[PDB]
């Protein structure tokens, strides 16, 4: 009986109808597609199950779709969402491989498609490098899956070959020293895909890790590499895109410290606060709120980034992971300097914000002003909330 699979049939039927509707709308010469975007958001809601993580991903992708305008980009983001959703439910390396590869192909094509102006060739260059680096990591995953399949005779993810699969997962999160594909991507690709790349796949992969993964090894050297390299790199790079790429490497090192000491509640709290800050960061038009992102990414006390860092520090001290904790505290002391550089650049400066001329007047002030109210979330964060 197939009566337990109506959501899958609904997914496929919705894709079949959406392609035909997008074709009919384009035969009329419509230069805007807000109706297509609303149908895409409805389809996103209709295929998502009733778990916390699934709906967090769903609501995140509904918010992200407001920064994309063409039909093909919307289709690629939907088919990347299918991989992102179904990776959280993957209990093998077969589905794991297919979901990861679908996401990689969608990201590569979007990086090629959306570039404009003088930065087109730089974006295509960085997309090619990302594709080549992704191909060999995919080959490593397939090779060691074949080794595990031959040794165990089954699809269980146990044994020594899980160390290389773990390295595949660490590549997909931009963990140093395999971090330079993300550093290349941050310097050229436009802001909407940078917003997409810093939020949704990290959530999808960490939920797969929380749900169906065990390894008998450690990730401590990659924690050290990510934290020290990210902090020193963001201290040393004057371009703002490289600053935010290296600060992202530092944040993924903190999330790996939360993974390594168990306690995924602190991981989920810090990831949620980080995702809301990212949603504020890449949609800013008034540059004074760039200082709020700075004080809430430096871990300064009353804002929500402090709470996200401080439960990670608390659980690390609870299980006595002293050396990694000391390295994390040193890199936190270093991170403050370049977040202060951000504050010097964009707060202690005269205010200029250009008006719109061709309509759409400051079109994402709702989301940015809503996400700035991360100064009111700390009242709920101090309680036993995320567990």
């Amino acid at each position: 009986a197939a009566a337990a699979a109506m959501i899958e049939l609904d997914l496929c039927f919705g894709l079949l109808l959406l392609i035909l509707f997008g074709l009919l709308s384009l035969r009329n010469g419509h230069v805007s597609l807000a109706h297509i975007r609303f149908i895409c958001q409805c389809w996103l809601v209709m295929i998502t199950p009733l778990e916390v993580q699934d709906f967090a991903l769903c609501i995140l992708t509904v918010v992200l779709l407001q920064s994309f305008h063409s039909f093909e980009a919307l289709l690629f983001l939907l088919l990347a969402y299918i991989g992102q959703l179904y990776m959280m439910h993957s209990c093998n390396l077969v589905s794991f491989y297919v979901c990861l590869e679908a996401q990689t192909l969608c990201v590569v094509v979007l990086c090629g498609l959306l570039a404009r102006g003088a930065s087109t060739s730089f974006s295509v260059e960085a997309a090619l490098k990302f594709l080549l680096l992704s191909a060999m990591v995919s080959g490593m995953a397939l090779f060691w899956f074949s080794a595990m399949y031959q040794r165990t005779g089954s699809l269980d993810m146990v044994g020594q070959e899980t160390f290389w699969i773990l390295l595949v997962m660490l590549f997909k999160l931009g963990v140093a020293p395999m971090h330079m594909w993300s550093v290349d991507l941050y310097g050229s690709i436009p802001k909407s895909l940078l917003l997409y790349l810093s939020t949704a796949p990290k959530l999808s992969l960490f939920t797969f890790w929380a749900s169906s993964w065990h390894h008998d090894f450690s990730v401590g050297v990659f924690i050290l590499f990510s934290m020290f390299i990210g902090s020193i790199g963001a201290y040393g790079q004057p371009a703002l895109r490289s600053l935010f790429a290296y600060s992202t490497i530092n944040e993924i090192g903190l999330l790996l410290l939360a993974v390594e000491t168990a306690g995924f509640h602190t991981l989920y709290q810090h990831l949620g606060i980080y995702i809301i800050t990212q949603l504020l960061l890449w949609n800013l038009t008034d540059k004074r709120l760039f200082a709020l992102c700075a004080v809430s990414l430096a871990g300064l006390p009353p804002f929500a980034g402090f709470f996200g860092k401080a439960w990670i520090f608390w659980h690390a001290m609870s299980v006595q992971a002293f050396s990694l904790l000391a390295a994390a505290l040193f890199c936190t002391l270093l991170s403050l300097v370049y977040y202060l550089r951000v504050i010097r650049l964009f707060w202690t400066a005269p205010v200029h914000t250009a008006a719109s001329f061709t309509g759409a007047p400051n079109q994402t002030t709702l989301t940015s002003a809503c996400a700035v109210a991360l100064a009111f979330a700390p009242v709920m964060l101090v309680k036993p909330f995320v567990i």
């Binding site: 401080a310 001290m317 202060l340």
Partner: protein, 443 residues
């Protein structure tokens, strides 16, 4: 609590006043700091001195942030509520008014908190405000702002895991149950020493103060000297001594030698200074070293004498910063070589300078004299030589104090004219407080 919410909401309404009404903006921001002075005076009226040690308690559920009043917190809160309207008289922009209003909220709530995580959250939420206040673009110094922020962050980051260690150990950060549980006192003691030895300027983590307290504006210098250093002392008296007392006994030779070398070396450095504001800025380190050793003696009435020295310093050194600020505001320099004969040209300002010079050197009829006598009683009762070190080095403090006064006040008359009504009334509450607390402090 309801009153505190009303005072915060009244204070925050300065932003909504349109800027073209200048008189209204000035009056509103001045009254917004006058009202908490009245409320804290009323809290002193309400206090029962024969009752419990902790009075007027309030706890906000499972959010930490629990509050209560003892004598040290009450005296420090009274001093802060005196000092903030004087700061309001020395500012001219809405940005300055709002920075000092937010600083007053954070200081007042930090002085009376009873939760260690609440103390951590409330105190160093002022870090970015201090960075913007010190590194202001045309006339500040970004180097000084970077130094003060980075030293404070370093100490706080050492404390934070030990805070969370005792929280996992017993289940709470409330100081009433942290003092009654069994905890690993060496680790938490080192974390608390790390924060409070940076807040109180103790060598070697003291180099931020000479840059920050000079690069700050006059209002910022009044706040930083008179208030923010004493948060380390109230940290010692409220959190570290009750919760980790075994550590506080075992670290006594190390804290003792840190206090002795801080006192001697900072007094020796003050003699070679050539900037008037740097002269006033160094002298605060030796006083805080005497405060720290009197706190750590724990001997006769150590909390009383050390709190009284904190109040006497918080009255006398902001007035010296105010006089240096007047000279800088109306002569555009802080350099000793440009000033001479200020007695003939500013007789009232020089008289105030002399009286506060005598107060800073702990002469009688000033609260510093009573303070230093009682602090040395507390130090003497552990050993006589630890008192002798401070006693014999009194010539070294008087040397720099009288040398600075004699160089700038006597000689050929050159320099600005005497004080205005506004400058005199910025100075005046500190003088009245000094005369009272140095003649009839108690009844």
């Amino acid at each position: 609590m309801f009153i505190s919410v009303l005072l915060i909401l009244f204070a925050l309404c300065v932003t909504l006043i349109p800027e073209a009404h200048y008189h209204m903006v000035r009056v509103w921001s001045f009254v917004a700091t006058i009202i908490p002075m009245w409320v804290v005076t009323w809290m002193w009226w309400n206090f029962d001195a024969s009752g419990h040690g902790l009075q007027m308690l309030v706890i906000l559920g499972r959010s930490h942030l629990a509050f209560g009043i003892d004598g040290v917190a009450l005296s420090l809160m009274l001093l802060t509520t005196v000092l903030f309207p004087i700061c309001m008289m020395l500012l001219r922009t809405v940005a300055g008014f709002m920075t000092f209003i937010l600083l007053e909220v954070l200081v007042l709530s930090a002085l009376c908190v009873l939760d260690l995580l609440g103390f951590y959250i409330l105190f160093e939420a002022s870090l970015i405000l201090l960075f913007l206040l010190i590194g202001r673009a045309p006339y500040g110094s970004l180097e000084a702002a970077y130094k003060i922020v980075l030293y404070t962050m370093a100490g706080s980051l050492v404390l934070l895991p030990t805070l969370f260690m005792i929280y996992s150990e017993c289940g709470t950060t409330n100081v009433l149950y942290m003092t009654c549980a069994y905890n690993h006192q060496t680790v938490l003691g080192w974390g608390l020493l790390a924060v409070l030895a940076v807040k109180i300027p103790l060598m070697p983590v003291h180099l931020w103060l000479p840059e920050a307290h000079v690069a700050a504006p006059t209002a910022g210098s009044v706040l930083l000297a008179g208030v923010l250093l004493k948060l380390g002392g109230i940290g010692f008296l409220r959190f570290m001594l009750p919760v980790v007392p075994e550590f506080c006994v075992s670290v006594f030779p190390l804290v003792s030698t840190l206090c002795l070398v801080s006192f001697l070396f900072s007094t020796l450095s003050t003699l070679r200074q050539i900037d008037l504001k740097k002269i006033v800025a160094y002298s605060s380190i030796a006083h805080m070293s005497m405060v720290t050793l009197a706190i750590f003696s724990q001997s006769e009435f150590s909390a009383y004498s050390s709190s009284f020295l904190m109040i006497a310093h918080g009255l006398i050194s902001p007035a010296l910063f105010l006089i240096v600020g007047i000279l800088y505001d109306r002569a555009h320099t802080k350099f000793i070589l440009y000033f001479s004969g200020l007695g003939a040209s500013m007789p009232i300002g020089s008289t105030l300078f002399f009286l506060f010079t005598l107060g800073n050197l702990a002469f009688p009829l000033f609260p510093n004299f009573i303070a230093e006598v009682l602090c040395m009683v507390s130090i003497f009762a552990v050993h006589e030589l630890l008192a002798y070190v401070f006693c014999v080095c009194q010539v070294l403090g008087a040397a720099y104090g009288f040398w600075a006064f004699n160089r700038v006040v006597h000689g050929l008359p050159r320099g600005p004219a005497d004080v205005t009504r506004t400058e005199f009334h910025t100075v005046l509450p500190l003088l009245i407080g000094a005369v009272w607390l140095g003649i009839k402090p108690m009844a």
